[PDB]
Amino acid sequence: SEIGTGFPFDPHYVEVLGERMHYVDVGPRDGTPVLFLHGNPTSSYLWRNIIPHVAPSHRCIAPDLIGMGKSDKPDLDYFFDDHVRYLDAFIEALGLEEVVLVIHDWGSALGFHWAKRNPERVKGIACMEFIRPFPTWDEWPEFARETFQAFRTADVGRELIIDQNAFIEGALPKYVVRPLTEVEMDHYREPFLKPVDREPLWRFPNELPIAGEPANIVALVEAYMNWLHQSPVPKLLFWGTPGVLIPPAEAARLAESLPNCKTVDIGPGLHYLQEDNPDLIGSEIARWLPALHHHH
Template sequence: MVDRTHRTAAVEGHRLHYLQAGDPDAPPLVLVHGGIIDAAHVSWGAVIEPLAREYRVVAPDLLGYGRSAKPDVTYSLSLHVGVLDSFVEAVGLESAAIAGISMGGGAALGLALRSPSAVDRLVLIDSYGLGRELANGRLTALLAKTEVFNKAAIALMRRSRGFTAASLGNIVYDTDALSEDAIDAVWEEAKRPGVGEAFRSFRAAEVTNDGYRTDFSERLDRMEVPTLLLHGEHDEVFPHRWSERATARIPDSEYHLLAECAHWAPRERPGTVVDLIREFVPR
């Protein structure tokens, strides 16, 4: 059993909570969660312990999420990139492997492009920032401008674990195969005060009528960091062709399409994610 410790860091005047596990002298691995209802332990809960056997795992709750501060700011991707950059410096990591899922992948990618010396290896899982196409076209754009549906869904999730489990069908291939811990993590997080506000702000900032605002595709040929891209075959949030296309552009990269997996690989295919990270990130 590898112990997780709860820690805090002062980042740009705000308190960021993070989990740390593993030997402090082991190679560092930063795990960055996604949006909607998420936090370090929610998306990464099943992989922190096995990864911490060989790495110093550091998993922050991004600003606006989990136990971290929730200031009244615009939660654009550029804000998360800046906060992640400052966080890595605040916890004393000169250079670290960074893995990010979904929105967290976009933040990790933005950091690798902005400060390549800070990122030793990059792992992108179902990542944002690799395309502009909206998942559901105009409906996605409309929902980004309308908060009521997201607020109503979160209210129902707080009241019902069953509704929470059913809602995860939007991001997983087979909800029946999800662990009880994964469902409970989301259900409990949905009850946290202020949950959803950062995501709604992010969505309003990043979704336009013409597509997602942030798309790093045209800069990928200048990427200096070795990159591993993982993508669920059945991901309906961001299509796997984004990662396939990005792999062709990033000079030093490899790609794995994950079968029987949608948008939440660290919870749907935790063993595979751990194995692929271990093969890619030096120990």
């Protein structure tokens, strides 16, 4: 029952756009792969206890986003658009055709954006605590409002996130219900031991589509949500209580609005649901994959 702290996955690397990206790659190579996309400030480590449920039946590919995890650290601005370029190039470098997406946070923005642009290549989407527009600050959860309003500044936000490592030392454990252990925290800390390497951790909250800003991300996210609401693709949406980005009432709304959507209550959860109930997330993804196979 204890949640595993180890990362028993051999490293793989691919060079795209001048830089090495690290990824997990396990499971059979003769089927449709399952592509796992983490968000901020995590890595493929976030999927460590989910992958073992899926690997028996399906290939599992879990990249570390550029600037994160064991991937290289170019001196980028780390805008969403930078992540889009790197992940698009990663997917093509691996020769992926059709996929199943398993996505969270900025990984969900990346995944939904890729799906909208490549709808014929997505067999299913399992999602959790995903990015949607927040049209005003009042739609953002109250207990994270002042935190994220401060993150979204050039002075205080850089001080908190880059100097003081607030995304790793603060937000990450705050948005897991159970206590993270020091071993787990050290795995999350490792990429960001050098303060200068924390740029992506600050740019990400500055890219969130909140209160109309930034306008490019608001438009992009509205576009993929419009696509999602019309798409017949099978969807599996995990949610927790109280949640952060997807509170229970919003999950229930989405169950009804999104086509061919199954919702799964994970129990207690805030944002990093994978750390509170990885076994239910993994076992439910695994159970749901076979019915996606057939092309109708």
